[PDB]
């Protein structure tokens, strides 16, 4: 499986991968993170199709295989309309489950705030409703880092030497501590990371790296709006997640009846560290709200 095509959304060509499930019981749309990465690192969710869950993957504007629109359209709100236009173009009036990871999570929340009427359930993994809070929390993680790496981030970071050999070394430690904690990073993840460093979305919207959000979404925060979401919601976050469970908590407190699951020994990309347990939890939640 997985039909791969080029859907023309909002005037531009958007790449998507739809993996159908035999006796389909539901359609799950997924939102990769970054901003500026690609669907690739989310391919582990493809296992849910064996659970009767069709999964829709797709590269957001300017990401991966999709073309980049005008820079003025590098916004969360624009991504929201893109998602809705794509869901409509491919599924029409059918309601679907929406899953978002990291930035994709934040994008999913903003989507739900406006288009929750097109959803059956919402799933956020390592997502966030507030970038500022995410920054504040990540800084703490930096302070808990060993002296060298902590100073490297501050010195080189404040000067902008992200290319420095020491700074990089610090970034690596942090990553293997809050991004992905397991050995042998799967090719799907590497490709998404490579996709980020190549396109322009990550550098313009996000910033230098994972813990450095100096881009255009630096002030984004819809913590006050996500409380309007009245659909079944599943929130997951790794124990050592770069987007700490503290950020997940805020989201959890606003969405009435939402479930918060903190994966132990996992971090950001929990779908790879605990693939079986992750996919099982997501499929269980989905099938519970058919």
């Amino acid at each position: 499986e997985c039909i791969e095509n080029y859907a023309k959304v909002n005037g531009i060509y958007i790449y998507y991968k739809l993996c159908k499930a035999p006796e389909e019981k539901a359609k799950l749309m997924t939102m990769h993170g970054g901003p500026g990465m690609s669907h690739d690192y989310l391919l582990s969710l493809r296992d849910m199709t064996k659970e009767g869950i069709t999964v829709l993957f797709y590269d957001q504007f300017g990401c991966g295989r999709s073309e980049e629109p005008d820079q003025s359209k590098f916004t969360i709100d624009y991504g929201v309309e893109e998602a809705e236009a794509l869901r409509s173009k491919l599924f029409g009036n059918e309601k679907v489950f929406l899953m978002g990871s990291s930035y994709g999570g934040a994008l999913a929340l903003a989507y739900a705030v406006k288009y929750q009427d097109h959803l059956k359930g919402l799933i956020v993994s390592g997502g966030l409703s507030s970038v500022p809070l995410t920054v504040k929390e990540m800084n703490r993680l930096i302070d808990e880092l060993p002296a060298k790496y902590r100073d490297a981030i501050k010195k080189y970071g404040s000067s902008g030497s992200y290319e420095n050999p020491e700074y990089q070394e610090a970034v690596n430690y942090f990553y293997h501590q809050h991004l992905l904690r397991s050995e042998d990073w799967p090719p799907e993840v590497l490709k998404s990371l490579e996709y980020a460093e190549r396109r322009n979305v990550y550098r313009i919207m996000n910033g230098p790296n994972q813990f450095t959000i100096t881009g255009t979404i630096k002030d984004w925060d819809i913590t006050d709006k996500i409380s309007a979401i009245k659909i079944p919601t599943l929130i997951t976050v790794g124990e050592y997640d770069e987007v700490t469970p503290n950020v997940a908590r805020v989201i959890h407190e606003k969405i009435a009846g939402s479930e918060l699951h903190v994966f132990r020994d996992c971090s950001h990309l929990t779908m790879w560290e605990d693939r079986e347990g992750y996919n099982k939890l997501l499929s269980d939640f989905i099938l519970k709200h058919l």
Partner: peptide
């Protein structure tokens, strides 16, 4: 963002 990275890796190596």
């Amino acid at each position: 963002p990275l890796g190596g």
